[PDB]
Amino acid sequence: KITERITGHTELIGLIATPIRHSLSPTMHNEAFAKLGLDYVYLAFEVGDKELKDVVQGFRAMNLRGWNVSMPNKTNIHKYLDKLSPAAELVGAVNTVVNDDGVLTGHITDGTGYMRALKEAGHDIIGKKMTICGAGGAATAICIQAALDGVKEISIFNRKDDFYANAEKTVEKINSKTDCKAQLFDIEDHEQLRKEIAESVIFTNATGVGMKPFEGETLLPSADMLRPELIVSDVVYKPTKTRLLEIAEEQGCQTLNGLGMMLWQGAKAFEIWTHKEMPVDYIKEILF
Amino acid sequence: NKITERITGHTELIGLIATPIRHSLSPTMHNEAFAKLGLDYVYLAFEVGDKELKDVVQGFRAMNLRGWNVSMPNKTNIHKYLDKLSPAAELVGAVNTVVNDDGVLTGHITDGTGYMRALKEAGHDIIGKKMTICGAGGAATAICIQAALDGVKEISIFNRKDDFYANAEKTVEKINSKTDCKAQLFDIEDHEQLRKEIAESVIFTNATGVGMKPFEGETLLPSADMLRPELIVSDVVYKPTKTRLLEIAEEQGCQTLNGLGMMLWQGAKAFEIWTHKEMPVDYIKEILF
Ligand SMILES: NC(=O)c1ccc[n+]([C@@H]2O[C@H](COP(=O)([O-])OP(=O)(O)OC[C@H]3O[C@@H](n4cnc5c(N)ncnc54)[C@H](O)[C@@H]3O)[C@@H](O)[C@H]2O)c1
Numbered sequence: 001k002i003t004e005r006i007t008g009h010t011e012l013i014g015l016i017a018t019p020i021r022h023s024l025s026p027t028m029h030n031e032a033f034a035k036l037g038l039d040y041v042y043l044a045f046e047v048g049d050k051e052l053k054d055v056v057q058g059f060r061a062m063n064l065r066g067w068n069v070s071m072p073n074k075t076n077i078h079k080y081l082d083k084l085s086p087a088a089e090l091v092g093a094v095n096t097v098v099n100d101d102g103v104l105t106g107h108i109t110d111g112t113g114y115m116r117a118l119k120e121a122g123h124d125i126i127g128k129k130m131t132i133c134g135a136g137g138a139a140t141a142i143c144i145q146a147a148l149d150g151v152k153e154i155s156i157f158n159r160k161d162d163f164y165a166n167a168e169k170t171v172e173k174i175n176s177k178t179d180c181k182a183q184l185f186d187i188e189d190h191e192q193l194r195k196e197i198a199e200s201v202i203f204t205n206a207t208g209v210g211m212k213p214f215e216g217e218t219l220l221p222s223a224d225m226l227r228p229e230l231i232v233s234d235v236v237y238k239p240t241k242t243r244l245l246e247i248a249e250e251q252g253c254q255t256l257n258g259l260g261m262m263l264w265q266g267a268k269a270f271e272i273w274t275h276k277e278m279p280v281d282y283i284k285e286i287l288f
Numbered sequence: 289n290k291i292t293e294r295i296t297g298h299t300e301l302i303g304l305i306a307t308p309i310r311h312s313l314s315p316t317m318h319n320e321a322f323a324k325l326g327l328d329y330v331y332l333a334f335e336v337g338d339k340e341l342k343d344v345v346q347g348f349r350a351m352n353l354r355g356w357n358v359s360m361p362n363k364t365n366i367h368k369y370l371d372k373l374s375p376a377a378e379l380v381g382a383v384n385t386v387v388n389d390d391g392v393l394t395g396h397i398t399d400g401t402g403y404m405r406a407l408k409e410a411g412h413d414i415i416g417k418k419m420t421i422c423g424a425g426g427a428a429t430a431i432c433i434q435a436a437l438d439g440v441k442e443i444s445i446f447n448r449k450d451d452f453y454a455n456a457e458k459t460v461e462k463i464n465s466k467t468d469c470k471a472q473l474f475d476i477e478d479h480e481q482l483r484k485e486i487a488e489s490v491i492f493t494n495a496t497g498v499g500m501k502p503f504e505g506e507t508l509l510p511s512a513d514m515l516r517p518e519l520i521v522s523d524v525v526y527k528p529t530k531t532r533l534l535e536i537a538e539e540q541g542c543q544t545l546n547g548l549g550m551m552l553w554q555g556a557k558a559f560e561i562w563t564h565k566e567m568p569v570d571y572i573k574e575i576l577f
Pocket residue numbers: 071110133134135136137138139158159161163206207208209211214219235236237258259261262263265
């Protein structure tokens with residue numbers, strides 16, 4: 001007569017970030033575990049700077065197989081891990097940890113997730129030019145992966161905030177370690193932005209503009225910077241159409257929000273922990 | 289809804305830390321209770337021993353867990369890492385249940401209370417009377433202390449001359465110095481003393497592993513004629529559901545009770561400490577067969 005699948009044999013996969021309780025990640029992974037008959041459950045914990053160290057040490061002692069990491073912990077957690085994948089070390093951010101016999105390896109799946117979503121949607125940018133806004137965890141993961149996957153040129157735009165120096169490092173990494181050509185400009189350099197967009201096959205927002213507390217706002221100065229043939233992409237998926245995507249759709253452009261990136265960054269994390277492919281079509285149908 | 293999993297980012301965790309522990313039925317009990325009441329919690333077990341305890345408790349503080357159960361080998365050491373203790377947890381020196389309020393961890397002991405509640409629910413009134421009990425391990429210690437704190441008048445403990453005998457001596461000292469209960473300890477080999485004690489008791493209880501694997505079919509009772517029809521015979525063991533002791537008790541006409549109620553009511557007590565809602569015990573008993 002027992003109907004709860006969770007017993008004393010059930011193992012835990014975590015998610016540590018704050019705020020985080022409205023995340024769709026637990027639903028995604030729990031539905032995937034249930035579909036494949038795997039005895040795991042995925043839970044979120046509200047963890048910030050003050051809690052991170054103790055939580056990781058606790059997870060080691062609890063022998064957790066792995067967990068995801070989100071804001072504000074992606075760029076700090078490496079300190080508490082043992083090894084980093086090549087991409088996590090290049091990016092300087094971790095969103096996924098796996099525990100192999102007590103050895104914690106940090107991985108980053110946001111970039112690979114973004115690129116897979118483009119590919120699955122039919123958008124080929126390999127050997128071509130991208131203009132992207134942002135220089136935080138998401139943008140850095142995307143820029144590095146785009147370069148590793150063979151995108152030809154990347155023009156990065158960011159405001160002159162604390163992340164601008166990070167973008168400068170990203171430019172140096174891309175130019176020295178890959179065959180991709182990268183440059184950085186101020187987002188307020190509107191004439192350069194117009195030129196870079198014109199010369200690109202895709203324009204991507206990888207900032208929080210367009211998502212609360214910037215819903216209805218955009219970093220795009222004019223709709224006339226977007227020709228109909230341009231692909232316009234946003235990492236944001238709540239709302240499902242940012243102001244940027246709305247303006248692009250009105251101009252006749254193909255658009256893509258962040259739902260695919262969310263699915264694929266999760267699919268990759270799932271496979272790292274379980275060595276099984278996430279049933280993506282099934283999960284997409286029920287959740288995205 | 290296409291979504292069938294009840295676990296989301298809102299779901300909170302209640303733990304269980306002990307080793308070995310993965311065959312525990314506690315997670316089934318609490319998860320079925322949470323689901324029945326529509327409470328957004330899940331209960332999970334973790335293999336935690338001496339080497340992991342400090343780090344796990346610190347981690348649980350940082351994860352802001354509402355609470356957790358504790359079992360062997362951590363019940364007598366965990367107080368080191370907590371902030372407050374209930375009176376019984378302090379006196380017993382063991383904690384099986386922790387709750388977190390605004391970062392302050394309070395240790396509670398619920399197996400004794402569970403034992404006493406199960407007797408009351410079965411219609412057995414032992415308050416103001418004498419209990420004779422076999423054992424001096426975790427279960428016996430908690431039952432003896434709790435029984436004394438709850439008003440049992442006299443407790444006679446019987447234990448073999450093993451490494452637990454010294455613990456029983458400590459239990460006697462605690463009861464006689466901190467309560468008005470009159471406690472005494474004897475060797476289980478003192479059959480003539482056992483006859484006297486049982487004859488004078490409202491209840492005779494087994495709180496040892498005898499009667500459960502690797503001692504199934506065995507009993508510590510020397511003679512059936514030490515029992516009488518008015519006596520209550522109780523066993524902490526519930527697998528099997530009728531130990532050899534309970535069979536003999538039934539043969540002598542005694543009232544009997546196994547340890548299933550103790551298990552359920554200790555869970556009910558912890559469930560309220562965490563959720564401040566009453567556990568549906570009858571519902572849980574039915575789902576556990
Ligand atoms: N779809 C997905 O799976 C997915 C995955 C990761 C991140 N994201 C999203 O990506 C966005 C960025 O996340 P992150 O982790 O890189 O954040 P971060 O804090 O690491 O970086 C923030 C970036 O946004 C820029 N920015 C912030 N506010 C700005 C403003 N008012 N004007 C101009 N620029 C501004 C910063 O300069 C920086 O480039 C968030 O909306 C997040 O939800 C989506």
